[PDB]
Design a protein around this ligand. Structure first.
Ligand SMILES: Nc1nc2c(ncn2[C@H]2C[C@H](O)[C@@H](COP(=O)(O)NP(=O)(O)OP(=O)(O)O)O2)c(=O)[nH]1
Ligand SMILES: [Mg+2]
Ligand SMILES: [Mg+2]
Length: 430
DNA sequence: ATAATGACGCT
DNA sequence: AGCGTCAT
């Protein structure tokens, strides 16, 4: 009864920018606003690979990782902006700084955890408490939740989206128990109000629009965020879960999108998140290991404990480049040359990092791919990073991989390299 | 010829 | 330490 722990202890939100790279490009170039458009890296191979798509472009079937030439076939009026190129490669600096604008704004409200270049989680538990004290005990008005959806409402005894949304919101507020300061749903509601505010501020001060999820944990906040994108936020209450999970494919839950999620489907013979409830913890631990079992057992009940880590800053800093097919690096002059290109970008990102964030990386990781290998990395090797010098860093990276050169000739490089990757890690205060 | 990255688990 | 998985 009262000792069944229910995962309602926290209030956690996930804010993710809408078609981010696109909005960055549209803020810069007014011509691209409210039009089908996409952002590509490179231009020579089939017009370039798409990495971001406005919603007007999505409505014609344009997706991430489509070639730009194929995309034009679906959507001939498609507008494109391409990623800056420096030192012979894609440079993402404009989106990193645009990201920092967003993160700095979110930081104002609460401690965030940077989960990607375009999203952060927030623990709103404390701020909800505060706002709750300050609102005395007066009703919460719909005018404070102008973009909020209540997952699973309306239900019970208009045909347009705004109509439906409001009915849902009304039902929820009409049944909200305001006098009870310890009510989880009331807390979510208040969290949701703050998130409206946070989103108003982001758009006011950056001109960028975003979606958000408000729930009791990260997994649910993330899932909820996706439900009503673009430019809308979504409250997933603890009670909405059984219905939500009842037809939620397992693959849609964070960290279940790959192999583990496949074996869950496969071993258990299920499709949806909620069918997990029929398994005892021990059983799921038997199949999926002890951590996964535990995590799965609670997750399918909407309970998840991972905390919102106070980390606004990346722990690693990295430059990488693929050299597909024919362009696979095949001489020792080439490998050196790109090591230097990568090294030089890395150097300028680190000097900026050290000035901005009062810290130095202490270690360099070197990673490569050989032709005829299947995985992201063929090989990783660490060395010291003692100076922010592109020559030393490039020289040293070379040093630690030269032995991988299987070639008999002096100058040649075999097998040819299909990837080079440098990553600075192990940071210490500066 | 998706491509550039970032986080984290396992051993 | 170096590899594997999952994500955006
Ligand atoms: N370079 C590179 N960037 C990528 C890749 N995948 C995503 N991004 C970049 C480009 C993305 O703009 C940014 C954030 O990605 P999301 O939030 O996953 N999708 P978005 O915000 O575009 O649209 P929405 O969220 O509304 O559906 O990360 C990639 O494979 N490579
Ligand atoms: Mg996004
Ligand atoms: Mg995202």
């Amino acid at each position: 009864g009262p000792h069944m722990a229910t995962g309602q202890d926290r209030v956690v939100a996930l804010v993710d920018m809408d078609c981010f790279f696109v909005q960055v490009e549209q803020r810069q170039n007014p011509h691209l606003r409210n039009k089908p458009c996409a952002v590509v890296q490179y231009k020579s191979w089939k017009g370039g690979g798409i990495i971001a798509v406005s919603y007007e472009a999505r409505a014609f079937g344009v997706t991430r990782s489509m070639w730009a030439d194929d995309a034009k076939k679906l959507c001939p009026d498609l507008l494109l902006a391409q990623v800056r190129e420096s030192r012979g490669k894609a440079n993402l600096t404009k989106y990193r700084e645009a990201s920092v604008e967003v993160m700095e704004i979110m930081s104002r409200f609460a401690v965030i955890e940077r989960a990607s270049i375009d999203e952060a989680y927030v623990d709103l538990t404390s701020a909800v408490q505060e706002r709750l004290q300050k609102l005395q005990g007066q009703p919460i008005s719909a005018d404070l939740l102008p973009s909020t959806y209540i997952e699973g409402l309306p239900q019970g005894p208009t045909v347009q989206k705004e109509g439906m949304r409001k009915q849902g919101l009304f039902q929820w507020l009409d049944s909200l128990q305001i006098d009870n300061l310890t009510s989880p749903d009331l807390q979510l509601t208040v969290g949701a109000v703050i998130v409206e505010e946070m989103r108003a501020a982001i758009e006011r001060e950056t001109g960028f629009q975003c979606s958000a999820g408000i729930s009791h944990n990260k997994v649910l906040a993330k899932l909820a965020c996706g439900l009503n994108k673009p430019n809308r936020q979504t409250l997933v209450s603890h009670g909405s879960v059984p219905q939500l999970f009842s037809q939620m494919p397992i693959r849609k839950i964070r960290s279940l999108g790959g192999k583990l999620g496949a074996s869950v489907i496969e071993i258990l013979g299920i499709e949806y998140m909620g069918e997990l409830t029929q398994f005892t913890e021990s059983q799921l631990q038997s199949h999926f290991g002890e951590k996964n079992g535990s995590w799965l057992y609670a997750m399918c009940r909407g309970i998840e404990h991972d905390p919102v880590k106070p980390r606004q800053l990346p722990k690693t800093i990295g430059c990488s480049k693929n050299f597909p097919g024919k362009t696979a690096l095949a001489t020792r002059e080439q490998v050196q040359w790109w090591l230097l290109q990568l090294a030089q970008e890395l150097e300028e990102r680190l000097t900026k990092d050290r000035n901005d964030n009062d810290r130095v990386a202490t270690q360099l990781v070197v990673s490569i791919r050989v032709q005829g290998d299947k995985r992201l990395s063929s090989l990783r090797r660490c060395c010291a990073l003692t100076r922010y010098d592109a020559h030393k860093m490039s020289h040293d990276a070379f040093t630690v991989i030269k032995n991988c050169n299987t070639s008999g000739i002096q100058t040649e490089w075999s097998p040819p390299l299909t990837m080079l990757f440098l990553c600075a890690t192990k940071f210490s205060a500066s």
